[PDB]
Amino acid sequence: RLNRVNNTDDIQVACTQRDEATLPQTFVDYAPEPREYFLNGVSTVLDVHTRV
Amino acid sequence: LSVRFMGINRNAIASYLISLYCSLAVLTDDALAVLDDVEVDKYHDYPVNYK
Numbered sequence: 180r181l182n183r184v185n186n187t188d189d190i191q192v193a194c195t196q197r198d199e200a201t202l203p204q205t206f207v208d209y210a211p212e213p214r215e216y217f218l219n220g221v222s223t224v225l226d227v228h229t230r231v
Numbered sequence: 232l233s234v235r236f237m238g239i240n241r242n243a244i245a246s247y248l249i250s251l252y253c254s255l256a257v258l259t260d261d262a263l264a265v266l267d268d269v270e271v272d273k274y275h276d277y278p279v280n281y282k
């Protein structure tokens with residue numbers, strides 16, 4: 180299962196000055212329905228003669 | 232006296248609570264006396280006679 184962050188542009192940070200300014204609030208959100216990876220198989224049946 | 236951390240607000244300012252608890256008791260009445268109506272602004276005029 181490949182989880183991912185889906186609000187990259189909404190993660191707010193602020194550059195501070197020498198003052199008492201208010202700070203932004205933020206959180207990191209994840210994709211609600213991530214893609215799940217499932218193994219596929221390459222398979223075959225080999226026949227060998229017992230006499231050989 | 233006690234000092235306790237209260238938290239940090241959204242302005243990045245931390246708050247501290249300082250408290251001091253005290254009282255006073257006079258066990259017997261005769262242990263305390265008070266003199267009232269004391270005037271502090273009067274100066275005496277002394278006679279002078281210089282050489």
